[PDB]
Design a protein around this ligand. Structure first.
Ligand SMILES: Nc1nc2c(ncn2[C@@H]2O[C@H](COP(=O)(O)OP(=O)(O)OP(=O)(O)O)[C@@H](O)[C@H]2O)c(=O)[nH]1
Ligand SMILES: [Mg+2]
Lengths: 151, 165, 309
């Protein structure tokens, strides 16, 4: 399913890197760089459904991406995934980030990435989609936040 | 708290002793693939005893828990006559580490309930506790099922570790 | 004594947290390598301390550096300590780091066994959930063999929150330890019947993956995949089942022969264009396999192209 989720700016600098399929650290970095060149060089009017990279294990896989301002969001998924469904999932993931960060911004990716990962973990588990209900995913996120605040 | 590393052969009674000490209860145990950590306060002194598994396959993993430890506890299965040697080679190799030169060794001779358990003196002789140099040590015949000798050992451990009332 | 403790606190106040690490990197980009390697050495020293909150902080910094491509595997044991912390507020940090830092070729595979099981046995669904998601990225065939014995029980946990997570990790267990898949296969079929659709959905994701990898187990389940599609109202789930159907029809055309009706009906009811495409694409493939001996597929195609238009 989902092999990796990457978030990076227009200079290739990382904002989030979470892999599901095992890669060496160098491979991971290289995948990011590959992805950067494969995605950041695409025009705003280019189809969000791209072919996969090669470092990830093959072009059969797909790079589903979305970007705005200077930030790029790339979902490395395999050949059996729904590019359209993924894109929908990408947007609602973002909606969750807004719900939890009261409008997520780059500074949350920069200084609150641990919670971004917590949120992400609630969205995707091991590359498999863990939650699709946007109010429930927020509910569980806050349930954990409450637990933390409590003790 | 006082950092104590407690080791021993598999099925010696490390888990049973640790859980009895913290909770006063003898719990059903399964082989420790990983480790256990529990912080116990005895006579106003808190001891964080790290229970590392005693299986041979994970015996090489004992190296990761040596650092900053202030005490060593060796649960001795006095009933396991067949493995008294393996216990003594393990103890000698453990004491060969320079990281444990200033730590203290308390010896728990466990499983005294069985009729064939040897006395603590024979435990010392087999483990060569008398031949140790620059090593403050004590031995106590212990019984995991009944808990006898555990509070004396804790008292001694505090006494060497603590510096005032 | 007391003032030495105070000194430690004072020194602590000048120690860098994750955000400080980041800010420093941003302020020292030109000297980034110098800055970070210095911070790493400071971390090495911090991880030799007895303050788990600080050490968890050090792990947070290392986790950041993991994102930056730094080798922090030398701290894996120390990360385990963080996972063994009495507070989940630090265990979670360790599990986060472990999910991206730990590898099956390292000795953590033995070291973590008890702590993992302890967290899985913990009544706290959030501690367990955290552990499960740590395992979802870091778990071996050996961990799969022994942890599954507890996880299968977790799939019957009171909370669907956990049942759901437990189901997805069992997929990975099957990938690494198919010997558990065998007895867990019918169990999964039972998990597909879970009243809570969120868990059920996860179960669907797993069984669809299992069928994809090994079609020999879908045949008797074809009626069930049908029922799952029929009863599901979750578009993502429908996509999974439907794509599976696209992958099953080549093996059993008569499945497609029957599916084409409810799929047609589905298409008529479909409001999501993202779903619509998947539906149309799928039935086209079905119609192709059915076109031989079925001279009405062009009417179905007519519909398809109306939708394609
Ligand atoms: N008869 C007797 N049995 C004991 C005593 N103490 C522990 N046992 C039993 O010895 C067996 C092994 O005990 P554990 O505590 O699991 O041994 P361990 O040292 O933790 O073993 P590892 O986890 O493999 O390192 C269990 O069946 C205990 O009930 C004792 O004093 N007398
Ligand atoms: Mg044990």
């Amino acid at each position: 399913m989902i092999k990796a989720i990457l978030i990076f700016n227009n200079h290739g600098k990382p904002r989030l890197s979470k892999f599901y399929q095992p890669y060496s650290e160098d491979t991971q970095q290289q995948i990011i760089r590959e992805t950067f060149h494969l995605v950041s060089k695409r025009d705003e009017n280019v189809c969000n459904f791209l072919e996969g990279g090669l470092l990830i294990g093959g072009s059969d896989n797909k790079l589903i991406y979305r970007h705005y301002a200077t930030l790029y969001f790339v979902f490395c998924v395999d050949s059996s995934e729904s590019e359209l469904g993924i894109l929908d999932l990408i947007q609602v993931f973002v909606e969750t980030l807004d719900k939890c960060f009261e409008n997520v911004c780059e500074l949350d990716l920069i200084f609150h990435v641990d919670k971004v990962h917590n949120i992400l973990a609630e969205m995707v588990m091991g590359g498999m989609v863990l939650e699709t209900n946007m109010n429930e995913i927020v509910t569980q996120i806050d349930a954990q936040n409450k637990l933390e605040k409590s003790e | 708290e006082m950092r104590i590393l407690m080791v021993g052969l598999d099925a010696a009674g490390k888990t049973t002793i640790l859980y009895k000490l913290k909770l006063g209860e003898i719990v059903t145990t399964i082989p420790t693939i990983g480790f256990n950590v529990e912080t116990v306060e005895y006579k106003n002194i808190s001891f964080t005893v790290w229970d590392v598994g005693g299986l041979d396959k994970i015996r090489p993993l004992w190296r990761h828990y040596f650092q900053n430890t202030q005490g060593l506890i060796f649960v001795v299965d006095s009933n396991d006559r067949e493995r008294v040697n393996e216990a003594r080679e393990e103890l000698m190799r453990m004491l060969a580490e320079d990281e444990l030169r200033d730590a203290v060794l308390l010896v728990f001779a466990n499983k005294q309930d069985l009729p064939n358990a040897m006395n603590a003196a024979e435990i010392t002789d087999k483990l060569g506790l008398h031949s140790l140099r620059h090593r403050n040590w004590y031995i106590q015949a212990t019984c995991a099922t009944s808990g006898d000798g555990l509070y004396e050992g804790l008292d001694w451990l505090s006494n060497q570790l603590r510096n005032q009332k | 004594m007391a003032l030495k403790m105070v000194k430690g606190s004072i020194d602590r106040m000048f120690d860098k947290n994750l955000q400080d690490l980041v800010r420093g990197i941003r302020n020292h980009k030109e000297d980034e390598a110098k800055y970070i390697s210095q911070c790493i050495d400071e971390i090495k020293q911090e991880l030799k301390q007895d303050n788990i909150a600080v050490k968890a902080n050090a792990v947070c910094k290392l986790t950041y550096l993991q994102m930056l491509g730094y080798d922090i595997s030398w701290a894996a044991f120390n990360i385990i300590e963080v996972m063994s912390a009495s507070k989940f507020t630090f265990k979670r940090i360790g599990y986060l780091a472990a999910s991206q830092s730990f590898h099956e070729g390292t000795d953590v595979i033995m070291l973590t066994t008890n702590q993992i099981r302890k967290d899985l046995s913990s009544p706290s669904q959030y501690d367990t959930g955290v552990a499960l998601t740590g395992l979802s990225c870091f778990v071996t065939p050996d961990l799969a063999r022994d942890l599954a014995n507890d996880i299968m029980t977790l799939m019957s946990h009171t909370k669907p929150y956990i049942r759901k997570k437990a189901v997805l990790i069992m997929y990975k267990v099957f990938l690494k330890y198919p010997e558990s898949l065998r007895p867990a296969f019918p169990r999964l079929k039972e998990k597909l019947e879970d009243p809570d659709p969120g868990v059920q959905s996860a179960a669907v994701n797993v069984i669809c993956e299992l069928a994809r990898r090994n079609p020999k187990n879908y045949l008797s389940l074809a009626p069930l995949f049908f029922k799952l599609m029929t009863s599901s109202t979750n578009n993502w789930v429908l996509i999974k089942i439907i794509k599976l159907f696209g992958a099953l029809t080549p093996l059993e055309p008569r499945l497609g022969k029957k599916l084409i009706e409810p799929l047609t009906n589905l298409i008529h009811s479909t409001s999501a264009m993202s779903l619509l495409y998947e539906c149309v694409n799928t039935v086209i493939a079905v119609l192709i396999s059915l076109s031989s001996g079925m001279p009405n597929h062009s009417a179905s195609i007519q519909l398809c192209v109306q939708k394609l238009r």
